[PDB]
Amino acid sequence: VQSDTHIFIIMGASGDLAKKKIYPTIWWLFRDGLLPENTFIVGYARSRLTVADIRKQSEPFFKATPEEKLKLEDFFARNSYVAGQYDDAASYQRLNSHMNALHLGSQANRLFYLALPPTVYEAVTKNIHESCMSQIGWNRIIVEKPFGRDLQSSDRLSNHISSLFREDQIYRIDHYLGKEMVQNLMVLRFANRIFGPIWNRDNIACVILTFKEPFGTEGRGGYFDEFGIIRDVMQNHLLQMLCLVAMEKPASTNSDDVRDEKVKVLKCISEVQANNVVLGQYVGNPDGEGEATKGYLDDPTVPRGSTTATFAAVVLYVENERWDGVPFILRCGKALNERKAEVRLQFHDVAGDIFHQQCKRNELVIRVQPNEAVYTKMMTKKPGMFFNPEESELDLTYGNRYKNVKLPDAYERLILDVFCGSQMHFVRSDELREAWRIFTPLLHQIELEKPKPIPYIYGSRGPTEADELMKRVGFQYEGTYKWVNPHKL
C-alpha cells in the first residue's frame, strides 16, 4: 500500500552502451510497467548535455510506437542530467544534492549503473560511497566486464570495491545469466526426474560448451588484440555455463545457495593445462564473398604479426564425485561458420549391447541461441519394414511451441533483478577469483611464448586440431545424425 522512490543513475550516460542499450532498456521496463511507480532516471557524464539530447540520441533505439507518446513524455519528465567529472569531489556533491531534491530523494533507493570504461571504476566507486550514498534506502552498483585482466589485477579492483561495498550491494554483469535458456538450465535439471538420475559420471561421456560467431574482428580488432578470446568469452560466459551444468542441487533457488553451488564447482577445477588447449586465428577466404576475404591480420587496426588467437578450445575437469574424469570442452571462435551458443551432453554407450554396434551415444542439447531449443538425441527404430535402430530425437523448439510468447533481452532481465534485489544472476567476488585462477597461468604463458595460432579460414568450424582434442578426451562424432525441419503438423 506504500512505495519508495527509486533513482536509476546512469554513469557515463553519454556513451554508446548507455545510448544504445541502457537508456533503451530502462524505457522498456518503464513502458512495460515493470519498475516501481516512483522511478527517476538520472544521467551523469562529463559532456554537457540536456535531457533533450539524451532523448534525441537514444529515442532511435527505443523502438517506440505512436500509442506510447504519453508514456514517452512521462519517461522523459522523470529524466534529468547532471554534468561532471569522475573524480571531482565538487561534481559528486552536485549529483548527490540533485537526488535528494527529487520527490523523497533522501529516502529513495539508489541504483548506479557504470556504463563506463574500466579505467574509472576505482575513482567512481570510491566517490559514490563517499558522497552519493543514501543514508536511508539501498545502494546497489552494477558493473561491466572487464573485471581485471588476470587474478592479481582482478583482485586489486575486487578488494577496492569490497572495501567500500558489501556483496549485497555489488552486481557484476555476465549477460549470459540474463539469457532465457541459460536460466532454463536449473528448471530442466531440478524440475525433471528425467534429467536428474542421469546427470553423473556413470552416464555422461563428456560435456561441451560452445560459443560461435560467424563474424571476424570487423574493423576494431585493435581492441580485441588486447584481451583475446579466453578473457573475452571463455573465462566468463562458457565457464558460467559450466557451473550451471555441473552444479549440485542448491538448498534453494536464492542468490546465496545458487552462487554457493557454483563457486564450489569452480574450486574443484585445476589450472587449465596447455596440452588441453587449441588456439586459432582466422585467415581470409579468396572464394569468400567480400568482408570475409580478409583475415585477422587484414585489419589495419590489428598489430602486424599479431599472434593473438580468435578461437580457443579448452578441456577442463571437475575433480568431484559427480564429474570425476568427465572432460568439459570449452569451445569459442570468430569468423566461424555460424552464430551459435550451446550446451551439449554426450552420454556413455549403453552396457550390454544387443543391437550389433548399431546404437549411437545419446545426447541432450540445450541451444541458447539462436532459435531457443532443447532436444535429445536418442535411438529409435528405423520406421517401416526395418528393425535396425537409427538416430532420431525428442524436440522442444521455442518459435513453434511458444510463438505468441515474446522473449526479453538479457539486459531487461538483469536490470529488473537489481530493482527487485535478486542476485543469483550476478557474479560473486569469490566466483570471480576462482575463474581467474584457472585461466591465469595459461593467459600469462601465452603472453611469454608467442605460440603462433592455428591458421583457419574465415568460415570453417575452426582448426581440425580442435576436433582431435575433443575426440581424444572422449567425444565421438559420427556424422550419421540426419535432421529435417518440419511441415504439416
Ligand X SMILES: NC(=O)c1ccc[n+]([C@@H]2O[C@H](COP(=O)([O-])OP(=O)(O)OC[C@H]3O[C@@H](n4cnc5c(N)ncnc54)[C@H](OP(=O)(O)O)[C@@H]3O)[C@@H](O)[C@H]2O)c1
Was 299 annotated as part of a binding site? Answer: no
484 binds a second copy (CB under 8 A): yes
Three-class SS of residue 228? helix
Least distance from C-beta 267 to a second copy, angstroms? 22
304 binds a second copy (CB under 8 A): no
- Residue closest to 42 by CA, chosen among 106, 111, 134, 136: 111
How many C-beta neighbours within 10 Å does residue 150 have? 17
Q: Which does 384 bind (CB under 5 to 8 A by kind): ligand X, a second copy, none?
A: a second copy
- DSSP string over 393-410: EEEEETTTSSSSSPPPPH
144 binds ligand X (CB under 6 A): yes
Q: Which of 107, 192, 273, 476 binds a second copy (CB under 8 A)?
A: 192
Spatial separation of the C-alpha atoms in residues 363 and 382, rounded to whole Å: 18
* Neighbour order of strands in the sheet with 79-83: 79-83, 39-45, 6-11, 109-114, 139-143, 170-172
Amino acid identity for residue 244 in this structure: L
Phi, psi of 55 (to 5 degrees): -75, -40
How many C-beta neighbours within 10 Å does residue 479 have? 5
Q: Which does 184 bind (CB under 5 to 8 A by kind): a second copy, ligand X, none?
A: a second copy
How many C-beta neighbours within 10 Å does residue 101 have? 10
Q: Which of 359, 454, 457, 473 binds a second copy (CB under 8 A)?
A: 359
Spatial separation of the C-alpha atoms in residues 119 and 156, rounded to whole Å: 13
200 binds ligand X (CB under 6 A): no
- Residue 274 DSSP one-character state: G
- Residue closest to 350 by CA, chosen among 339, 363, 360, 342: 360
Least distance from C-beta 111 to ligand X, angstroms? 15
Least distance from C-beta 194 to ligand X, angstroms? 15
Phi, psi of 126 (to 5 degrees): -65, -55
Stretch that binds a second copy, among 59-67, 209-217, 347-355, 444-452 (CB under 8 A): 347-355
Q: Which of 12, 24, 84, 463 binds ligand X (CB under 6 A)?
A: 12
Strand (E) or helix (H) holding 211 = strand 204-212
From the candidates 6, 98, 237, 425, give the one annotated as an active-site residue.
237
Q: Which of 61, 138, 227, 375 binds ligand X (CB under 6 A)?
A: 375
Here the cell at position 376 is 535429445
Spatial separation of the C-alpha atoms in residues 360 and 197, rounded to whole Å: 20
Q: Which does 45 bind (CB under 5 to 8 A by kind): a second copy, ligand X, none?
A: ligand X
227 binds a second copy (CB under 8 A): no
Cβ pair 332, 210 in contact under 8 A: yes
| Segment 408 to 467, residues that bind a second copy, using CB under 8 A | 408, 412-413, 416
Least distance from C-beta 117 to ligand X, angstroms? 4
Was 339 annotated as part of a binding site? Answer: yes
Was 238 annotated as part of a binding site? Answer: no
Sign of CA dihedral 231, 235, 240, 242: positive
Q: Which of 56, 103, 401, 472 binds a second copy (CB under 8 A)?
A: 401
Here the cell at position 224 is 580485441
Spatial separation of the C-alpha atoms in residues 206 and 345, rounded to whole Å: 6
Cβ pair 350, 472 in contact under 8 A: no
373 binds ligand X (CB under 6 A): yes
Stretch that binds a second copy, among 166-174, 243-251, 300-308, 432-440 (CB under 8 A): 243-251
Q: Which of 163, 301, 337, 400 binds a second copy (CB under 8 A)?
A: 400
Which lies closer to ligand X via its Cβ, residue 16 or residue 349?
Answer: 16
Spatial separation of the C-alpha atoms in residues 157 and 173, rounded to whole Å: 15
Instruction: Clarify whether 348 is annotated catalytic.
Output: no
Q: Which does 406 bind (CB under 5 to 8 A by kind): ligand X, a second copy, none?
A: a second copy
Least distance from C-beta 24 to a second copy, angstroms? 17
Per-residue binder mask for ligand X (CB under 6 A), 333-352, x = binder:
-------x------------
| Segment 384 to 413, residues that bind ligand X, using CB under 6 A | 393, 395, 397
Spatial separation of the C-alpha atoms in residues 346 and 476, rounded to whole Å: 9
Active site residues: 237
Residue ranges for the known binding site are 12-19, 46, 121, 145, 175-179, 213, 232, 331, 334, 339-340, 344, 367, 369, 375-377, 395-397, 461, 477, 483
Residue ranges for the known binding site for D-glucose 6-phosphate are 145, 175-179, 213, 232, 334, 339, 369
Residue ranges for the known binding site for NADP(+) are 12-19, 46, 121, 145, 331, 340, 344, 367, 375-377, 395-397, 461, 477, 483
